[PDB]
Scaffold this active site. Structure first.
Site, short mmCIF file in Angstrom:
data_model
loop_
_atom_site.label_atom_id
_atom_site.label_comp_id
_atom_site.label_asym_id
_atom_site.label_seq_id
_atom_site.Cartn_x
_atom_site.Cartn_y
_atom_site.Cartn_z
N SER B 152 0.80 -1.23 0.00
CA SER B 152 0.00 0.00 0.00
C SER B 152 0.83 1.27 0.00
O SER B 152 1.85 1.38 0.69
CB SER B 152 -1.00 0.08 1.19
N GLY B 153 0.43 2.26 -0.81
CA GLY B 153 1.16 3.51 -0.94
C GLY B 153 2.37 3.44 -1.85
O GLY B 153 3.16 4.37 -1.93
N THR B 157 -2.19 3.59 -6.33
CA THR B 157 -3.24 4.59 -6.49
C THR B 157 -2.85 5.63 -7.53
O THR B 157 -3.65 6.02 -8.39
CB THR B 157 -3.56 5.31 -5.18
N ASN B 199 0.42 -2.39 6.56
CA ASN B 199 -0.14 -1.26 5.83
C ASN B 199 -1.09 -0.44 6.69
O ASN B 199 -2.14 -0.92 7.12
CB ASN B 199 -0.95 -1.76 4.60
N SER B 202 -4.85 0.56 3.68
CA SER B 202 -4.91 -0.28 2.49
C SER B 202 -6.34 -0.61 2.17
O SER B 202 -7.08 -1.04 3.05
CB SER B 202 -4.14 -1.62 2.74
N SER B 203 -6.75 -0.52 0.89
CA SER B 203 -8.08 -0.95 0.48
C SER B 203 -8.11 -2.45 0.44
O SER B 203 -7.18 -3.10 -0.03
CB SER B 203 -8.54 -0.40 -0.88
N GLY B 458 -1.62 -6.47 -2.05
CA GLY B 458 -0.45 -7.26 -2.41
C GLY B 458 -0.21 -8.43 -1.51
O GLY B 458 -0.96 -8.70 -0.58
N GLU B 460 0.81 -10.04 1.52
CA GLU B 460 0.97 -9.57 2.89
C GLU B 460 1.56 -10.66 3.76
O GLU B 460 1.16 -11.82 3.72
CB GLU B 460 -0.36 -9.08 3.53
#
Ligand SMILES: Nc1ncnc2c1ncn2[C@@H]1O[C@H](COP(=O)(O)OP(=O)(O)O)[C@@H](O)[C@H]1O
Ligand SMILES: Nc1ncnc2c1ncn2[C@@H]1O[C@H](COP(=O)(O)OP(=O)(O)O)[C@@H](O)[C@H]1O
Ligand SMILES: [Mg+2]
Ligand SMILES: [Mg+2]
Lengths: 367, 704, 181
Positions: B152-153, B157, B199, B202-203, B458, B460
């Site tokens: 995430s990040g 996005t 994260n 995170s979506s 992703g 994890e």
């Protein structure tokens, strides 16, 4: 890093690393297979349940003690004990550390060899050593002189030690306490109308042998008032709700340990085997053997010893000589508290039997 | 090689330069180039061949003389200091988030520089992939997909909005869909974004924004699709993990003229929130704004969570601003707060033992006000709802003679699993009503072809991994299967096209890893659905049955054999180690069965559907267009499934991806703090080995 | 594919596929022949009526319960019960499904053998098994331990089961409830 003291109990296997607290795992050694046909069809069942898990499921198993008459029954059950012990209690692989095992004094040769040899090949430890269970209680009491007692279900032993040498010529091993006290309690509680034929139910006999019995000070005179109307009944409650009120047999069962002529066997009482091991030592040393009579082992936990033993020995010992008997707290863990001090300290870091040394030497390295 | 500098295992930077000054069968005596006196030993998997001149970088990574995984790592170390964040690695684009605005690379002058030009005619950029996807659509007669993985990040996005900007500005020439994603940006964040250990925000669902192209090839519409929102997270959270972000932004951000209506309390008073982390995210000004009655003991003791981009007090305010921007009314927004607050008072109901006669289970004395203050939110009668949460209603009418309606009580464990099955039904059907309301603010003109973006969570991995990470990483193994399937097909469509050869490689399959997890009554998920059915479910019987029957498989060992020392503490029936594309990740089996075993009784599914409120009856389908109502009673399917419903919905996405082309964009995060110029080679090297990039380089043997 | 549970009650024979709701068909274990002279000359009648219809035709038949004090009287009446159950209730072919049959705990040898043999040769089923009715009542309340009191017409039983083994030496069968009631 650390060594592991894992004690090959008669009972009551004890396991815990070297220092600083108390044994981490205790369970009563048994393996138990399921004795009836299955109907729930998970299938979901182990080939054999070891202890403690084999004691939380009494009445549907056929309990088999792997340690019987001071020797292991076969290593087919023993390796499964070992695997259970390391894995579902301590949580470590044996290849990680030097181990420390215990045995019974005067152990049958080659059953300490075959043991040492099999344990190296089965678990692949990086170093191994075997110390006798009686000697380790010397370290636990912190003494330098005195006679040491490892009394477990069912082989006791009587070893004299002097500053700090052991004496090969005075060590006595008795086949008596504590499984003969268990078997005898079942034979004289059946005498008051309570039958317990099956192995699993025999465990209940051990549990009242622990909890409710005590040692008489003067047998004949405690026996006299027991014969009187006076209430010595303590009421035990059983798993199915049965209420048993026992009196006489309560002090009768441990008393068996004095004068084994209750069974009718020739073997002398602990009273005299203690004494005869002292009078097998050289005359000058006897002076410091009195007042270093140190008892140990869980089978000595009954209330009324050692001051029965004290009064009895003081009567048999020569006049105007002082005998104080040393009874530790927490005697059930004495041996282990011995092992813990030894294997944690230098010098004995360089006194293990190591992997190359073992491979080069072979099974004839134990002696 | 012999003599030439090779890569050496360096702690902070991943790899450093070094030479070989003595060698063994698999151990190498490595002398470092820049730290010559350290001279260590290192293995065969820690040494890699390096290029002659270190004064170069490659735009086309297929141009390397020594192409390996260490020289790919050195190429994005040099290019990061040249202000180049895009890297062409065959048909795979590696985009690195720089955490600042680079001069003139996202501009409108930059967009018309790339326009219509193919790969190998313009240098690495994300607009050369977005321009490829329009040309490998209309001419090829194939719909397209941009597949975005990574932590995430990491820029997953940001690269996606630059693609949808490029498809609207460069080829749509209008069509109002580009900033409608932006206008409801915090609105879709709250419902699906949660907090995991690795994260912070995170979506947790598969956001699948599709862009419709017609037969004329103009941009005629878009549509937003959602896949696989985590079922367990709704009810259970682990240590320092949270639920979704709307369950913290509604608790923290609700006002006092709204909280008196919803009857909210601090998170320690809500059973589906107090088991995880109850701390809110904030900033220096909003940390002064969170009220004394909104604080839980965790917030009273340890305050707000730290992260520069996260504020849970303000984003409930900026969420309700966004409902004015996208298209939700003022009457309906209040009904969208009664349903969310009804989930929070659903978890507080509790069920004790049997009284005496007729067996079953009853409610607790302290759970009477917990049902009454919930039944006015979900619209159910307070006397009728107690019966449906404790009995199983069925009939003596079924095929022979006409009978009547009988009552069979539920067990205590069957009522605890049934109450959490209702919360995993209501918030799941609420989330399809939020997405379907958004898709009606821009209803498409027509359809035929589509260029969509698949973005998913992703690979994890944490210190202790659970059932939530077993279902995320099982989704990434199947997406890794489809990754390697398109790469082998691309080389097969290249060697007779450019005349390179008839050469062919042994394909990297993973069918034994698939067959291990799912099969025809052989997999781990097959045993898991069998354990839910058992008379008394257990946690010791679920682990032991996996190594009873699945023992022969190579990608499975006992937890005590673990390479990572930390997972050796776990014992036989407490866990297992499963080897995947990104390595061997061990999982504990604690609560694994408990999270799977939710099930929903027929006259409890047919009681929340029968709701005494109007916004609520709309939630459990079906629409007016071709109207047809759900039946009053049923029988089958009882258990239904959790781990099979998660597998079934994933099979609906893998077969849609098989009808589309591929545009694989892997996003790398350079550092933890998310700051410019900073570099961590203990995090960059780990994302090349957890994003499937290593499996591609180990499939590339070409040498061309 | 879908297995069939068909219960050889002495009630109230119960028939329904494997799970998940309730018995599809239940009717009293009655076959009944006509005891009066025919005079309307349809003719229109059967040589033997099973239930439900042998309980709509009361007062014109001689009802014969084929299972009496825990045993089936003869397989000539039993096969006609079976034929009614598969065909005009469940409707499915017997060769289609594996079946599951029930018995009474402690039922006389060789009445499970003779049953198994006759049922294979008469209906030509592809696979089968016979589970005792008391043991199955454990599963219904989902307990792995306890003493089961399973009481139906015309045999009740008292079977003890412990996690999850049934003691062969403690099982009691009473030939009492409910036909003697
Ligand atoms: N409070 C007690 N009173 C009497 N006997 C006991 C008591 N506690 C334990 N025991 C007995 O002691 C035995 C355990 O002795 P232990 O020291 O473990 O011997 P070992 O170490 O040789 O196995 C058990 O078999 C039990 O019967
Ligand atoms: N409400 C009731 N009260 C008393 N007896 C009943 C009731 N309902 C049914 N029965 C009796 O129970 C019997 C059915 O029992 P059942 O469970 O079918 O036994 P089986 O399954 O062994 O055939 C019938 O013969 C009937 O007499
Ligand atoms: Mg001993
Ligand atoms: Mg019956």
């Amino acid at each position: 890093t650390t060594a592991l003291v894992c004690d090959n109990g008669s009972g009551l296997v004890k396991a815990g690393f070297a220092g600083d607290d108390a044994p981490r795992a205790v369970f009563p050694s048994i393996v138990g297979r399921p004795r009836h046909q299955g109907v729930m069809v998970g299938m979901g069942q182990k080939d054999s349940y070891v202890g403690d898990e084999a004691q939380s499921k009494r009445g549907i198993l056929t309990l088999k003690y792997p340690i019987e008459h001071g020797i292991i029954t076969n290593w087919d059950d023993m390796e499964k004990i070992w695997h259970h012990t390391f894995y579902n209690e301590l949580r470590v692989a044996p290849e990680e550390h030097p181990t420390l095992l215990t045995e019974a004094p005067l152990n049958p040769k080659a059953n300490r060899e075959k043991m040492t040899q099999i344990m190296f090949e089965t678990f692949n430890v990086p170093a191994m050593y075997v110390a006798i269970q009686a000697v380790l209680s010397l370290y636990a009491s912190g003494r330098t002189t005195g006679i040491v007692l490892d009394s477990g279900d069912g082989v006791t032993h009587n070893v004299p030690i002097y500053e700090g040498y052991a004496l090969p010529h005075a060590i006595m091993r008795l086949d008596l306490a504590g499984r003969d006290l268990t078997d005898y309690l079942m034979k004289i509680l059946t005498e008051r109308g309570y039958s317990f034929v099956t192995t699993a139910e025999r465990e209940i006999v051990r549990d009242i042998k622990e909890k409710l019995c005590y040692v008489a000070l003067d047998f004949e005179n405690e026996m006299a008032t027991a014969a009187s109307s006076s209430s010595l009944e303590k009421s035990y409650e059983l798993p199915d709700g049965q209420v048993i009120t026992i009196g006489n047999e309560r002090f009768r069962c441990p008393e068996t340990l004095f004068q084994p002529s209750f069974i009718g066997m020739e073997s002398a009482g602990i009273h005299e085997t203690t004494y005869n091991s002292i009078m097998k030592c050289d005359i000058d040393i006897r002076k410091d053997l009195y007042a270093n009579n140190v008892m140990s082992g869980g089978t000595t936990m009954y209330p009324g010893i050692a001051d029965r033993m004290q009064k009895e020995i003081t009567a048999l010992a020569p006049s105007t000589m002082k005998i104080k008997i040393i009874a530790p707290p927490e005697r059930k863990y004495s041996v282990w508290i011995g092992g813990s001090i030894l294997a944690s300290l230098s010098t004995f870091q360089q006194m293990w039997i190591t992997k190359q040394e073992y491979d080069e030497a072979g099974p004839s390295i134990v002696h | 090689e012999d003599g030439k500098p090779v890569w050496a295992p360096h702690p902070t930077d991943g790899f450093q330069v070094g030479n070989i000054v003595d060698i063994g069968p698999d151990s190498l005596t490595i002398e470092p180039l820049n730290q010559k006196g350290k001279t260590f030993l290192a293995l065969i998997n820690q040494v890699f061949p390096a290029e002659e001149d270190s004064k170069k970088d490659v735009e086309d990574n297929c141009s390397l003389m020594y192409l390996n995984e260490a020289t790919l790592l050195h190429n994005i170390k040099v290019r990061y200091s040249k202000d180049r964040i895009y890297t062409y690695v065959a048909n795979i684009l590696i985009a690195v988030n720089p955490y600042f605005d680079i001069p003139k690379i996202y501009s409108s002058e930059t967009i018309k520089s790339y326009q219509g030009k193919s790969l190998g005619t313009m240098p690495p950029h994300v607009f050369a992939i977005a321009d490829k996807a329009f040309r490998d659509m209309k001419v090829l007669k194939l719909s397209q997909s941009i597949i975005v993985s990574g932590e995430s990040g990491a820029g997953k996005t940001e690269n996606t909005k630059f693609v949808l900007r490029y498809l609207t500005e460069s080829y749509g020439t209008g069509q109002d869909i580009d900033d409608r994603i932006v206008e409801a940006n915090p609105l879709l964040e709250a419902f699906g974004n949660a907090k995991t250990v690795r994260n912070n925000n995170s979506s947790r669902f598969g956001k699948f924004v599709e862009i419709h192209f017609n037969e004329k090839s103009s941009v005629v519409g878009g549509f937003v699709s959602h896949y696989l929102l985590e079922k367990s997270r709704i009810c259970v959270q682990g240590k320092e993990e949270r639920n979704y972000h709307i369950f913290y932004r509604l608790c923290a951000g609700a006002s006092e003229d709204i909280r008196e209506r919803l009857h909210l309390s601090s998170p320690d008073n809500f059973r589906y929130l107090n088991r995880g982390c109850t701390r809110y995210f904030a900033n220096k000004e909003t940390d002064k704004q969170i009220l004394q009655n909104r604080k839980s003991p965790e917030y009273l003791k340890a305050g707000s969570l730290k992260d520069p981009l996260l504020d849970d007090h303000g984003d409930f305010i900026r969420m309700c601003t966004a409902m004015k921007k996208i298209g939700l009314d003022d009457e309906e927004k209040l009904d969208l707060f009664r349903v969310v607050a009804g989930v929070l008072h659903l978890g507080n109901i509790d069920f004790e033992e049997a009284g005496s006669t007729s067996g079953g289970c009853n409610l607790k004395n302290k759970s009477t006000q917990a049902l009454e203050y919930c039944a006015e939110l979900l619209g159910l009668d307070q006397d009728d709802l107690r019966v449906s949460l404790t009995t199983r209603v069925m009939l003596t009418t079924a095929g022979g003679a006409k009978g009547t309606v009988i009552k069979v009580p539920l067990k205590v464990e069957q009522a605890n699993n049934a109450r959490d099955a209702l919360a995993k039904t209501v918030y799941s059907h609420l989330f399809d009503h939020v997405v379907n309301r958004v898709n009606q603010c821009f209803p498409f003109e027509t359809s035929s072809y589509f260029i969509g973006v698949l973005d998913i969570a992703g690979f994890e991995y944490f210190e202790h991994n659970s059932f939530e990470q077993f279902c995320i990483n099982y989704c990434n193994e199947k997406l890794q299967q489809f990754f390697n399937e398109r790469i082998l097909k691309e080389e097969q469509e290249l060697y007779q096209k450019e005349g390179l050869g008839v050469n062919e490689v042994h394909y990297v399959d993973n069918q034994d890893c698939i067959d291990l997890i799912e099969a025809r009554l052989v997999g781990i998920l097959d045993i898991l659905d069998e354990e839910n059915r058992l008379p008394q479910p257990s946690d010791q019987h679920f682990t032991s049955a996996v190594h009873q029957k699945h023992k022969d498989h190579f990608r499975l060992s006992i937890p005590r054999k673990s390479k990572l020392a930390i997972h050796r503490n776990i014992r036989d029936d407490e866990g297992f180690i499963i080897r995947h594309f990104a390595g061997a990740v061990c999982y504990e089996t604690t609560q694994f069965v408990e999270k799977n075993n939710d099930a929903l009784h027929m006259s409890l599914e047919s009681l929340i559907c029968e709701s005494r409120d109007k916004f609520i009856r709309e939630l459990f389908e079906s629409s007016t267009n071709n109207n047809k109502d759900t039946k009053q009673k049923a029988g089958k399917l009882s258990f239904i499934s959790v781990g099979n419903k998660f597998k079934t919905q994933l099979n609906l996405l893998l077969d849609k991806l098989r009808s589309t082309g591929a545009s694989f964009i892997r996003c790398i995060k350079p550092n933890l703090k998310m700051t410019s110029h900073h570099f961590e080679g203990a995090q960059i090297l780990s994302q090349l080995q957890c994003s499937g990039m290593v499996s591609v380089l180990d499939l590339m043997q070409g040498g061309f």
